[PDB]
Every structure is written in C-alpha cells, then in structure tokens.
C-alpha cells in the first residue's frame, strides 16, 4: 500500500542531480558530496581508495537511512590539492585497477579453458 516502487533505488528523477557538492566551511579545503541513487557499493570503494592518498587527510561516508537510496561523503585534502581533483584521481585509479583485473582474468580463463 505504502511500499515504494523498486526502480526508485536506481532510477534517477530528472529534477534530482546525481551529484551535489557543497563546501564545508568549518575546516579548510573540505567539501561535502551527496550521491543520489547509490549505496555502499560505490561509497566503500571510493572511500578505501581515497584513504590511501597521502594528500587526503579526511574521508568518510554515511548512509542516513536504509530506506532511502543515497549517501553523503565528506572529503578534506591538503592545502595544495583541491578535493575534487582527488576524487577524480580516485575514480580514474579504480577504473585502471578494474581494467587490468579484467585483462588478467581473461588471460587466466583462456589458459585454463
């Protein structure tokens, strides 16, 4: 009766932006990123990738409520680095890691086929 539609977990409304960024003025060089229609799958990947960068001093995320499909991430880098550049570097690095993983799996599967 009051159950929401299941496609609302991943289908993005037109008026809702996928990615909203607002600065966090309490500490220097910090931003708050709000991801819509995402969950732990992308969030944990990004967080653990960014935690290893020497120029990222704080990274965290939280899912406010399990019944709503979104999460909010806090990122805070050194003085030299803008946080959005660090986020882009994390995305590209994980993409390269996945690409080489796929290549190696294909090689191994062909060998053992």
């Amino acid at each position: 009766m009051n159950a929401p539609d299941r496609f609302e977990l991943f289908i993005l409304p037109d008026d809702v932006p996928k990615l909203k960024i607002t600065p966090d003025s309490r500490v220097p060089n910090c931003i708050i990123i709000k991801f819509e229609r995402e969950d732990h799958t992308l969030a944990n990947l990004l967080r653990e990738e960014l935690a290893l960068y020497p120029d990222v001093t704080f990274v965290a995320y939280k899912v406010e409520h399990p019944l709503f499909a979104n999460f909010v991430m806090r990122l805070q880098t050194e003085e030299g680095t803008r946080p959005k550049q660090a986020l882009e570097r994390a995305c590209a690095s994980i993409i390269n890691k996945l690409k080489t993983l796929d290549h190696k799996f294909n090689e191994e599967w062909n060998i053992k086929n």
């Binding site: 009766m1 009051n2 159950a3 929401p4 019944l67």
Partner: protein, 57 residues
Amino acid sequence: LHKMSMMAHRVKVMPYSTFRLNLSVTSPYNADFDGDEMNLHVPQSEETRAELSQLCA
C-alpha cells in the same frame, strides 16, 4: 497510566505502513514492536499547535 504516555512528536513522512519511534521512547510508552499499536492525534489550530510544541514535547 501516566502523563508520559501522551507526548508530542515531530512528523517525518516515510514509506511503508507503520509508525516509527526512536527506541529510547519505548520506555515511557511501555511499548515494544511485537504488535503494539499507538494512536496519533493532529492539532487543528495555531493555539493548539503551540500548546503541543511548548508543553507536551
């Protein structure tokens, strides 16, 4: 049984068909989630809304 059995909360609209409570307030209500039901009453005036938010909160 006592006056803490009627308290005024702030509405948050949520999906699905059950009332939802922070678990700390289950003690004054003597309530648990094994099938209990609770009543909700809506004030219909500015005066009554102020009374609820300033006295029974």
